[PDB]
Design a protein around this ligand. Structure first.
Ligand code: CLA
Ligand code: CLA
Ligand code: CLA
Ligand code: CLA
Ligand code: CLA
Ligand code: CLA
Ligand code: CLA
Ligand code: CLA
Ligand code: CLA
Ligand SMILES: CC1=C(/C=C/C(C)=C/C=C/C(C)=C/C=C/C=C(C)/C=C/C=C(C)/C=C/C2=C(C)CCCC2(C)C)C(C)(C)CCC1
Ligand code: SF4
Lengths: 164, 41, 106, 64, 731, 80, 51, 26, 32, 107
């Protein structure tokens, strides 16, 4: 109960919709023998389903008027009420991987311009070079903020313009 | 076969190997971790 | 056909433009009344089927007669400011006669 | 004397309407005559017409 | 040879684009032959009389057809169940089932139900009888003839204004703020207090007895003494009946907030104190600028002197005044920016705060009046950037604008466009990606795996305005706060009763379907500005074409060279945005209509379940609500929706005709016409006929405009057919 | 009558003249280049503005330059 | 009657006068124009469903 | 036709002033 | 009362046809 | 008459196993519409052994076709006047491909 909401372990339309889905799976399950793999598959679907509802209520996800897990994307309402795993943890779990791919792709382009013809090595990726920058870019925020302090991250007004 | 490894190191071939890597990694994780809507512990 | 094109009044140069528009007027006179008199909005009224369709078709001749005179003031022995005005005059008088000639032919 | 830079030096283009404005290329030759635009510069960056060279004047052209 | 009297370069054109460009640059006064700047301002000034004389003839037309063919005197007595009438129908193409299916509203012949809602506006400003509407029509028809004659006389050489009369930005802005805005609103409170307040209390104040009826029982005595609260003593009660004296009340300037209980409209009394208050402020703000009397502010010393130190904004606003006063496209671009935002502000504040009686009960009126002033706002806002892009070509002077804030815009112009291109790309990735994620979770039968982010940052605002549905207990939902306790007699209890009513459109309750669509609106706002600000900034040149200013605003291309330059001009950069504009206003009006359909039907959960994923937009709003629209005519019969059924297919037809001018381009068509010229010049007996203007295909820039017009007309007529007939079909 | 105006950035490689499908362009002596020649447009009455000239100029920010003016019966490319 | 341009311009315009000023009253056929009829049975109901 | 002929007899004097406006301006 | 059966064929058949004509003959005037 | 034809089965990972419908016949899978089962009853297949042996016969034939394009380009590629015998190509394609093909299929 943060913004008119309720815990999904406490709401009833959530549990009503769980019983709605398991009803649809079981009336689909009835057409098969109890040994048959079209019934082994559906009972494995249920145990993935029933554990999914158990795990969403375990994490304390917020339901509402429709009985669905609602997310809270604000720190200070997720840090305070124990919901940083909804948005506030994957907003840095993403931005680690995002700037990682950016930094590896940056370092591959920076370390290819001092060559004979760098356009050839954007077709033919230097795999012993590219994987070497791939592994060693794992501390990229530790390397970027040191490059941020110099002035070597931002190229100056050598950049190309039209008519300022 | 050095010329054959250049072909394996072109742009679309590394793209179709790395995308089978990255999808195939996320497929195996989403098998052994069924339905991660929220970061649990 | 080089024989037949020298017959019909668009190419008869040796005729006055009044009689030229008169024959063109009646020829399109009792002919364009056909669709209105048969399959207009009054097919299924067996007294107005020849009246209003012919009266509408005479209205269409009136539009085309204005549509001719508009062309003569736009464009400029027929291709003249006067020969065309005699041509559109004969089409109006020849066209209204032919639409009445269509209603006579009942 | 020999006006313009040397035969193969790096250079920076200052013509604001050129495609290689603020951009670095190599001088290939400087014509020693009364031509308005003697300095011939070759680039790696090809333009929108695929032409990698152009003539420039003495004053639109700065070293390094 | 004679028709483009303004452009002799078009008069020497032997082809048929002479007709098309005689029409389309006839109001491009800056490019006519022999045009001077004194001749420029006089034709603009007379044309504004031409726009005003049309508007008042238009409005007098609305007053006439309502007074003659409408049922306003019948609608006054029962304003809920009786449907309004726009104008009666005489279409002789009709059939007898199409006469009796359009007779409705208790009328005699066929009629149109007015969805413009000018009855609710007229009923609350005091109109009660048809004889009061004919007088208003004859009045505006006189006033429209005044502005016709004024635009004629202010072109006559005795009465032509001087060139310095137009550039007096001091005296205009001093007169239009104080007189045109202040005195007008002061006079409109004069219409409210004298006439429109006591007409709701069941007291006829006509032109015969307005010099006999006191508006207030102790009138003009509190104004001259000072106790102005005497004007708010006995207001319209909570059991008032609009149009009668049953629980009437006697106050003239009350300050309540919230809504009238019957009409669910704004109170008439605080609308009187509203237009009185801003009348005082506009008159006071209308004594600011130095015209002729030694006091006031000079515009030439407020812009230039606001330069921040340490080079924050270049040379400040130094030198803008001669580039605003001399340039018209800068003045037009500001005006279309201002009016285009306070056209949305009209639309955003009339569904939530309906100002006219028995509005927000007539639902088709509410649907039309919101959607109208959103597309009207959409077209005006993209023209602000259009005439902002014409400014940088026709009027911009870099020597005059050394280092000001306007040139720093062109200086860091790639930082503007690339940061817009990041925001537009981030929103489009992560709004579509969430809907597709939700759609797949609906497709795999598991709605619990959806991404449903609760709109915290807006629910925090609604709770701060007094919506205790969410329980933030922050400011006005907080009963022990300060702002709650500074206004319990001032303006709050009407306002707080009006939000927490669940059945009006005042601060609707929102869920994660409203999270996703406001970001989609934010996508559509940031992308439409991306196209337009790029069209403004790169109007003078790019690296692809560094002399775009030499061709002009509206040119086709610069050839196939340099890789190909289709759609390079700033006109062609403006026109792409109209697609992304109609998309964006299409997104705000889909969301407005469907949240209001589910509100007015009652199934308010049918939106919030289905708005979280894009199939529910399709199979619950477009599929479900077009059931009675497309059944307007069938082989069983037809009903009153057949004129909106026909237009709904008529709108799809103009729309798809627009793709013909957009996908097929000119040069397929010019070769096709060359065969038609051959087959005309060789056909016997049709060689009697020959053209004057040579048939050529429509030019490249024209094909943009003709195709965008067919795109946009068919866009508008489609949705307006769906909007009117889905609302009024079930209502 | 289209407006074709060329500039001093011409080098006189005469590729614009060979590319012009309407003989708008011709080569005039001029000392500001090694090839001692600069183009000229004495026949802009015949120009359609198809811009095959400035697809062919090698110089950056094209030396030949075509401005689409008012279209007569020769500028619209008409056999009729 | 008419042989020049401006005589034909008058006769077409006056024939357009003579049809239309009659078409409003005498020329509205009983079977052609159902608007020029009497008020038939019903139709004046609400817009349906709800309000 | 009371207010029709009175507006027409008003339009007569209005047109007569229009003959004053159609000459005194040029 | 007889108005909507008269003004509509004027504005829709007759007065546009005058504007179809006069605003066409004006187009192809040869300028003196 | 009752069992719907189905020949595509998906993997149960993200909930996409719901695309394995109840097509009948003790089976779950995507109900296909390409009509191979009607070819195969017309071919009289009657067993999934026959479908497997002609699938291995398809892989063998595909590698033979990849060999043939490799052979007739890289190792032994025809001259120009081989291709310009359009009389010999039509006599062979009308007789051998279309003629003997429909003789063989009738058999
Ligand atoms: C658009 C930005 C925005 C808005 C409208 C809000 C809105 C709110 N924040 Mg908030 N917040 C934001 C960004 C925002 N936050 C960011 C970027 C941070 C830093 C990570 C925080 C950190 C934050 C804290 C630490 C707290 C809030 C609190 C609050 C609430 C007061 C209100 C719901 C407070 C709250 O819960 O209510 C008192 C609170 O404790 N926020
Ligand atoms: C708000 C309506 C409005 C107003 C006030 C004017 C006003 C004027 N028009 Mg315009 N015009 C309009 C709508 C309007 N026009 C429309 C809808 C079209 C069709 C696209 C035209 C087409 C048009 C042409 C073709 C010409 C004018 C001309 C004129 C001027 C006489 C005057 C400035 C004439 C002009 O400015 O010539 C100097 C002229 O030649 N107008
Ligand atoms: C006090 C004297 C005075 C007054 C009353 C006016 C009045 C006017 N001038 Mg003006 N003028 C004046 C002095 C004055 N002028 C002087 C001294 C100069 C010379 C320096 C000029 C120079 C000048 C020029 C050059 C032009 C005008 C124009 C206009 C017209 C404005 C267009 C319009 O109607 O939009 C008025 C707009 C509104 C009323 C809407 C805005 C109001 C609010 C903020 C919007 C939201 C509320 C809305 C009203 C609610 C609507 C509800 C309901 C009505 C639907 C208007 C008649 C223009 C015109 O049309 O020419 C005649 C024009 O081109 N004037
Ligand atoms: C912002 C000002 C404003 C506006 C827009 C209106 C608008 C209206 N009033 Mg109203 N009124 C106002 C101020 C205003 N009033 C004030 C201050 C008073 C107090 C004296 C009144 C008293 C009043 C009465 C008593 C009545 C109206 C009526 C009306 C309606 C029809 C007008 C009419 O009968 O024309 C006829 C107009 C006249 C006979 C005289 C008008 C006086 C002059 C000519 C107006 C000058 C304005 C000017 C020409 C416009 C500028 C353009 C030029 C520069 C219309 C809703 C009538 C109605 O239906 O309401 C229920 C009605 O009976 N009004
Ligand atoms: C410009 C608008 C306008 C105009 C023309 C009038 C005109 C008039 N008012 Mg009025 N009035 C106005 C605005 C206006 N009022 C406003 C804004 C208020 C509210 C503060 C009032 C409140 C008011 C009262 C309370 C009274 C008048 C009265 C009068 C009349 C005589 C005034 C001497 C006259 C008809 C008096 C009168 O005789 O009523 C007809 C009267 O008793 N007015
Ligand atoms: C205050 C309003 C205002 C004013 C005065 C102007 C004034 C001007 N604009 Mg501008 N403009 C405006 C608003 C305004 N604009 C808005 C809101 C937009 C965005 C939609 C634009 C977009 C715009 C562009 C892109 C251009 C101009 C141009 C011009 C100039 C030439 C006028 C012209 O081409 O008219 C002639 C107009 C027409 C012939 C109308 C064309 C057809 C339109 C689309 C109407 C079609 C409606 C359709 C027929 C509906 C019927 C459907 C049927 C089924 C019922 C002139 C200075 C041009 C310019 O300056 O060139 C450099 C130019 O290129 N304007
Ligand atoms: C439904 C049609 C549609 C769509 C999707 C777009 C999308 C876009 N337009 Mg628009 N546009 C359209 C119609 C459309 N437009 C029309 C009709 C016009 C008029 C001509 C324009 C005119 C226009 C202009 C003028 C501009 C745009 C811009 C943009 C971009 C906005 C940034 C954004 O949201 O990025 C988000 C984009 C997406 C979510 C689409 C990507 C889809 C997925 C994520 C890609 C990966 C999926 C998959 C792996 C790929 C499969 C391929 C293969 C492997 C099989 C985006 C690419 C602007 C731009 O470039 O901004 C950056 C811009 O300036 N457009
Ligand atoms: C908005 C104006 C308007 C009006 C008032 C009409 C009126 C009519 N149309 Mg019509 N129409 C219009 C616009 C209009 N149309 C347009 C824009 C189109 C193109 C989409 C059409 C396409 C159309 C078709 C395809 C048909 C009609 C038909 C009819 C008739 C309905 C059947 C009954 O009467 C039936 C009454 C009669 C047959 C009696 C004859 C009455 C005629 C019209 C008198 C002649 C008038 C005069 C001599 C000439 C006109 C003056 C000139 C200056 C133009 C009626 C006369 C139907 C018809 O029969 O046409 C007449 C028909 O088939 N219309
Ligand atoms: C009677 C002999 C015969 C037969 C059966 C064929 C059959 C074929 N020829 Mg062909 N051809 C022949 C003689 C023959 N040709 C001669 C004499 C010439 C020279 C004039 C050519 C020149 C020729 C060209 C230039 C092309 C063909 C192509 C084709 C194929 C058509 C593709 C198709 O419809 O799929 C039908 C597919 C099948 C029936 C599958 C069975 C395939 C069999 C096993 C291979 C064909 C039999 C082979 C010719 C016999 C030699 C065996 C080999 C081991 C030596 C088809 C395989 C086209 C093709 O696809 O290129 C590869 C093509 O481009 N032929
Ligand atoms: C291109 C260009 C142009 C154009 C531009 C434009 C078009 C613009 C627009 C603009 C816009 C469109 C803007 C907007 C703005 C807005 C704003 C800025 C807002 C603000 C807000 C506020 C401030 C609020 C406040 C508040 C709140 C918070 C709520 C409550 C109340 C209050 C008041 C408190 C021109 C022409 C100049 C020319 C040059 C260039
Ligand atoms: S414009 Fe067209 S025609 Fe004139 S030169 Fe350039 S290319 Fe040749």
């Amino acid at each position: 109960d943060i913004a008119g909401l309720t815990p999904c372990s406490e709401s009833k339309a959530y549990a009503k919709l769980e019983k709605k889905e398991l009803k649809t799976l079981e009336k689909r399950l009835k057409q098969y023998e109890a040994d048959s793999a079209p019934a082994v598959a559906l009972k494995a679907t249920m145990e993935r389903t029933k554990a999914r509802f158990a795990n969403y209520a375990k994490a304390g996800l917020l339901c509402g008027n429709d009985g669905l897990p609602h997310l809270i994307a604000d720190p200070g309402l997720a840090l305070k009420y124990g919901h940083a795993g909804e948005v506030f943890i994957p907003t840095f779990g993403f931005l680690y991987v995002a700037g990682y791919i950016g930094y590896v792709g940056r370092q591959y382009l920076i370390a290819v311009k001092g060559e004979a013809k760098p356009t050839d090595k954007e077709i033919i990726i230097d795999v012993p070079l590219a994987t070497k920058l791939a592994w060693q870019g794992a501390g990229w925020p530790l390397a970027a903020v040191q490059e941020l302090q110099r002035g070597t991250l931002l190229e100056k007004e050598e950049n190309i313009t039209v008519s300022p | 076969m050095k010329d054959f490894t250049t072909y394996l190191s072109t742009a679309p071939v590394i793209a179709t190997i790395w995308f089978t890597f990255t999808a195939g990694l996320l497929i195996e994780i989403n098998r052994y971790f069924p339905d991660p809507l929220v970061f649990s512990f | 056909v080089a024989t037949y094109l020298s017959n019909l009044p668009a190419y008869r140069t040796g005729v006055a433009p009044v009689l030229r528009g008169v024959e063109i007027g009646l020829a399109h006179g009792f002919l364009l009344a056909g669709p209105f008199i048969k399959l207009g909005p009054l097919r299924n009224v067996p007294e107005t089927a020849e009246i209003a369709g012919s009266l509408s078709a005479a209205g269409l001749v009136l539009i085309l007669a204005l549509c001719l005179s508009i062309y003569g003031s736009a464009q400029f022995p027929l291709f003249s400011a006067d020969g065309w005005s005699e041509f559109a005059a004969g089409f109006l008088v020849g066209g209204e006669a032919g639409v009445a000639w269509a209603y006579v032919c009942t | 004397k020999e006006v313009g830079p040397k035969r193969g030096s790096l250079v920076k283009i200052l013509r604001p309407e050129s495609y290689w404005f603020n951009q670095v290329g190599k001088v290939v030759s400087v014509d020693q005559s009364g031509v308005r635009y003697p300095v011939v510069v070759r680039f790696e960056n090809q333009n929108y017409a695929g032409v990698t060279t152009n003539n420039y004047a003495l004053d639109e052209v700065v070293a390094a | 040879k004679l028709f483009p009297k303004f452009s002799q370069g078009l008069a020497q054109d032997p082809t048929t684009r002479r007709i098309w460009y005689g029409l389309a640059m006839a109001h491009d006064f800056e490019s006519h032959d022999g045009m001077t700047e004194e001749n420029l301002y006089q034709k603009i000034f007379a044309s504004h009389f031409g726009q005003l004389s049309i508007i008042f003839l238009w409005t007098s037309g609305n007053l006439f057809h309502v007074a003659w063919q409408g049922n306003f005197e019948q609608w006054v007595t029962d304003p809920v169940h009786i449907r309004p009438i726009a104008h009666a129908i005489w279409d002789p193409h009709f059939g007898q089932p199409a006469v009796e299916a359009f007779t409705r509203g208790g009328a005699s012949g066929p009629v149109n139900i007015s969805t413009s809602g000018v009855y609710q506006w007229w009923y609350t400003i005091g109109m009660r009888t048809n004889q009061d509407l004919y007088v208003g029509s004859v009045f505006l028809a006189l006033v429209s003839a005044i502005f016709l004659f004024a635009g004629w006389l202010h072109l006559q050489p005795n009465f032509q204004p001087s060139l310095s009369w137009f550039k007096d930005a001091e005296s205009r802005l001093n007169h239009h703020l104080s007189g045109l805005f202040g005195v007008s609103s002061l006079a409109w409170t004069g219409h409210l207090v004298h006439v429109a307040i006591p007409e709701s209390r069941g007291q006829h104040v006509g032109w015969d007895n307005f010099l006999s009826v006191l508006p207030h029982p102790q009138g003009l005595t509190p104004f001259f003494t000072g106790n102005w609260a005497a004007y708010a003593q006995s207001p319209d009660t909570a059991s008032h009946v609009f149009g009668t004296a049953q629980g009437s009340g006697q106050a003239i300037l009350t300050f309540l907030g919230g809504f009238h209980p019957q009409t669910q409209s704004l109170w008439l009394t605080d609308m009187a104190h509203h237009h009185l208050a801003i009348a005082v402020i506009f008159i006071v703000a209308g004594h600011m600028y130095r015209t002729n009397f030694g006091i006031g502010h000079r515009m030439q010393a407020i812009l230039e002197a606001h330069t921040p130190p340490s080079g924050s904004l270049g040379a400040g606003h130094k030198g803008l005044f001669d580039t605003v006063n001399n340039s018209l496209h800068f003045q037009l671009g500001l005006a279309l920016a201002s009016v285009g935002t306070i056209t949305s502000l009209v639309a955003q504040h009339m569904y939530s705060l309906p100002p006219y009686a028995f509005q927000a009960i007539d639902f088709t009126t509410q649907a039309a009046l919101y959607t109208h002033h959103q597309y009207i706002a959409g077209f005006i806002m993209c023209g602000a950037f259009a005439h902002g892009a014409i400014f940088f070509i026709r009027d911009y002077d870099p020597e005059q604008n050394k280092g000001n804030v306007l040139a720093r815009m062109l200086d860091h112009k790639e930082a503007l466009i690339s940061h817009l291109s990041w925001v537009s790309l981030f929103l489009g990735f992560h709004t579509l990606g969430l809907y597709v994620h939700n759609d797949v979770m609906q497709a795999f039968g598991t709605p619990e795996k959806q991404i449903l982010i609760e709109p915290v940052f807006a629910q925090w605002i609604q709770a701060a305005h007094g919506k205790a549905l969410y329980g933030f207990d922050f400011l006005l939902s907080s009963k022990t706060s300060a702002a709650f306790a500074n206004g319990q007699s001032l303006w709050l209890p009407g306002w707080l009763d009006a939000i927490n009513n669940n059945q009006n459109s005042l601060f609707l309750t929102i869920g994660p379907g409203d999270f996703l669509v406001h970001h989609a609106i934010a996508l559509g706002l940031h992308t439409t500005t991306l196209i337009l600000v790029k069209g403004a900034l790169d109007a003078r040149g790019s690296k692809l074409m560094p002399d775009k200013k030499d061709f002009g605003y509206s040119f086709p291309c610069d050839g196939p060279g340099r890789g190909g330059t289709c759609d390079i001009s700033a006109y062609d950069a403006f026109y792409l945005a109209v697609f992304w504009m109609l998309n964006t206003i299409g997104w705000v009006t889909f969301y407005w209509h469907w949240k209001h359909l589910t509100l007015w039907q009652g199934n308010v959960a049918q939106f919030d379940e289905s708005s979280t994923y894009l199939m529910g937009w399709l199979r619950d709003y477009l599929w479900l609500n077009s059931s009675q629209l497309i059944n307007g005519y069938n082989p069983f019969g037809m009903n009153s929706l057949s004129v909106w059924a026909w237009t709904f297919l008529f709108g799809h037809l103009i729309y798809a005709t627009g793709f013909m001018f957009l996908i097929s381009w000119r040069g397929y068509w010019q070769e096709l016409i060359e065969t038609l010229v051959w087959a005309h010049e060789k056909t016997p007996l049709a060689n009697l006929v020959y053209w004057k203007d040579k048939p050529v295909a429509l030019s490249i820039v024209q094909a943009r405009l003709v195709g965008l017009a067919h795109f946009s007309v068919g866009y508008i007529f489609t949705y307006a057919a769906f909007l009117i007939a889905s609302t009024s079909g079930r209502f | 009558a289209h407006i074709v105006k060329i500039y001093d950035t011409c080098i006189g490689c005469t590729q614009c003249v060979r590319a012009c499908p309407l003989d708008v362009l011709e080569m005039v002596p001029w000392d500001g280049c090694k090839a001692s020649q600069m183009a000229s447009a004495p026949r802009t009455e015949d120009c359609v503005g198809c811009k095959r000239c400035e697809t062919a100029c090698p110089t950056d920010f094209l030396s030949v330059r075509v401005y689409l003016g008012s279209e007569s019966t020769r500028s619209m490319g008409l056999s009729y | 009657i008419i042989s020049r341009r401006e005589s034909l311009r008058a006769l077409v315009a006056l024939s357009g006068i003579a049809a239309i000023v009659t078409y409003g009253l005498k020329g509205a056929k009983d079977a052609d124009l159902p608007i020029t009829k009497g008020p038939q049975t019903t139709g004046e109901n609400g817009k349906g469903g709800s309000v | 036709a009371a207010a029709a002929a009175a507006a027409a007899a008003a339009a007569a004097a209005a047109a007569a002033a229009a003959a004053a406006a159609a000459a005194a301006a040029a | 009362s007889w108005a909507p059966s008269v003004f509509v064929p004027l504005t829709g058949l007759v007065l546009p046809a005058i504007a179809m004509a006069t605003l066409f003959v004006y187009i192809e005037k040869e300028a003196p | 008459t009752h069992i719907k034809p189905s020949a595509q089965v998906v993997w149960p990972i993200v909930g996409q196993e719901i695309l394995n419908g109840d097509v009948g016949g003790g089976f779950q899978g995507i109900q296909i519409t390409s009509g191979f089962f009607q070819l195969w009853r017309a071919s009289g297949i009657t067993s999934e052994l026959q479908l497997y042996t002609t699938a291995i016969g398809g892989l063998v034939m595909a590698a033979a076709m990849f060999f043939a394009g490799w052979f007739h380009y890289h190792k032994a590629a025809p001259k120009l006047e081989w291709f310009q015998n359009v009389e010999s190509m039509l006599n062979h394609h009308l007789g051998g491909l279309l003629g003997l093909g429909s003789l063989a299929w009738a058999g």
